[PDB]
């Protein structure tokens, strides 16, 4: 574990991702992803070990320890220098894909603030990821373009004038651009409306998946599925428009259940807080259920004195990889449920004692 | 009206005292049934006769006192509001049948240790209620009250049969003893259903609280008493309860050692429900209070008194909750006010 | 516990009941019961404590320590001198009824060999019971008449010339005689035939009950239900005839399943022996199931080297009252299942080591 690997696996929620983005009650994050390949180098499907090593080596040489103004310094993490639990944490923080952990010459060039993650030797040689809190696809696209320009200064992209950027996936040819949004939709699930919505979203060339990428914790990721022939601007508007609708529909449904079944909803969310604050065993499944309830309670003003950032942190912190990393070494499922309960209840008791004791001074 | 204190407090100060084995045995009850010689049983008595029985107690007993028990006061069932009558049932001071008797009454000791029901199934029902496991002391108190009443009353007796009661089974001593026991471990470990039939073979009967086994609270009483002496009736129950106390404690210790973390999770989750819910029924309330009580008993839950739980067990009953709130309440309204009451009482203790 | 009470609660199977009676593969025991009342004494329903005490006292005075030639010495046990577990054992050995344990002045005059049990102050003042192993109702009736003559020498029975012996139950008036047979009918249960038989038995004025008096262990007690107007000889023939039919039908059904499903039946009974010989926990319910299977295996020659007397003993010995008595004090159900398993497996391992080691010498 290098000092920079420790830096990226240490915190479940980066300071970058703790910032308040627009519509952050419904949209947790926005992701922009640009795929490219080296000109004259065979796509990862048919390239040699030597080729893959050169891609990583060229990045360590020209981009490691280098900087972009306004984004910060970039550090290169090689998958081969990371223990299995270290790699899982990077997955659970949404910094790398699961498939990157299986790539023998996989690596990722990460900005120190964790806003930019350039995956190397995944499905394409280069996958630039920009991750913003809340709803900011245009802002994420700008950062993506800065990193893209930065890399193209020293890398010649597989490009042709009639097809655009050449990618391994034939559908991906063109912009290499994929946009996804992470959304918390507890009211649309609760009111039994989401299963009549998802089929409509899939009609618009988008795809809906759970947090992993079933929808535990009522968290849904909506991303571009069809991009062949679309411009960058069309790709981002196709997702933006659907997300903005979902923001409105999820808000209306929250206001609806709050107005019609106020006490039942308070009972639901405080009972879930009750579980999190007193349980001695809890699985990931139930944790996700309860965290969703409490987050809905916070958003509606029912659950008081608890910030949403604590909940975002626990959603990552209670994942099985991160929980084992944080506890030091692998753990049986039963042991995890005991450690998870202790971590959640202690983190929660801590947040209500700060809120008790700093509020008391005033 | 000193009726107010009999309806206002859920747990009498008398019942807050620690009695023996109070972790398993919540209370001990001794009940003596008698009838007036030459007055027909309540099954066939006249309005005039029933009214005289109540009047005699008002004249010669109400405002009178017993040394070591304190002053007694008469409550007439016909002078008590419907919810007041319900609170007395929920506090275990009077039976449901008494609230239905038009000439019913109860002469209550001020400390709430003694409740003499008048004009129920018999003309006189003497009951003594002690906290914990103390049948013998409760029997002494009952005989003291019995002697007191017999100074001015001639009991329906028959040389070949003993005290005459309405129910033919109760003829003889008129005595029924009862214990209220909290048996969560024998329920959890799926043993109570193989215990109850053995209890029933010994001439006892087992019932739920207030007369399903809600709250894991079991009432064990003498069912067969015909031909038995006072000493045999009390010991038959004492020996079975003593065995149950031991078995429930062993079952608790076993769970504490084999499933420590699961037991803490069960009781703290129930504490979580009680302190954070916004609606709760009587049923779930009892479930959770049983879990917290077991946690207190085993030392898992700290800083919370079992007396607070005993009090909540009464305060959350529907009659007491309506009395406490000042008017009748729909079941849904009760569940909202019950949750708020439980929530508030738990928060105050934790400060 | 008196030296004579210890004598009666010590053994689960008396030497008297270990003898081989006729048809002992199907019929475990025969019972004859004669009810009488004292002339001029109110039936137990309306008698006084004084009256009941005199009945017991007259019996202690004139019958305690007394004898009948050919039956033996009689000992009087007062229910009030017996602990609750002591009384239950006497029930589980079939010596007294459950209701006698609830009678305040109940007692029983027992012969030392346990063939005769005269219950006192139950439903009638006197209930003479004669219990024989196997199928011997006429033999049991003769012993019943000997005890009846014996008691009438010093007791004047409630009798009138037009109704006969006067008993509390109005149906019982006449002979006061009730005859029952304990039968093991595993094949008729196994072949799903017994539920089409019991309704026919109930038509003939008989009644069918489990071992207690559902049919755990496939053991059924068939007794006289209707006796008003019947002579003694008619009462005994009504039961004898039905029992003799059941003996034949149960034997034919055993021969049938043995012939058609030989290996399946051997697997069934040896698997049940397997449970009894190796289990560390077992309830009464499963014990009864397995003991029935093994007994059927012994009877058919499938299960070798194990005598039926060991099984009869275990059927009583594993009852909850006797198991607690044998172990000293009451026991939680869980503790019983552990002690029961140990008792059965050890008794069984003991019987196969005698059979191993005394057979080896020859
Ligand atoms: Mg570009
Ligand atoms: Mg008295
Ligand atoms: Mg005769």
Numbering used by the authors:
A (entry chain A), C (entry chain A): -1 to 211, 215 to 363
B (entry chain D): 1 to 211, 215 to 354
According to the publication:
McsB is a prominent member of the specialized bacterial kinases and has the unique activity of phosphorylating arginine residues.
Octamer formation proceeds along the extended edge of the brick-shaped McsB dimer, where two clusters of polar residues enclose a small hydrophobic core. In the McsBBS octamer, Arg337*, Arg341*, and Ser285* of the molecular neighbor closely interact with the pArg194 phosphoryl group, whereas Asp338* tightly binds to the positively charged nitrogen of the pArg guanidinium function.
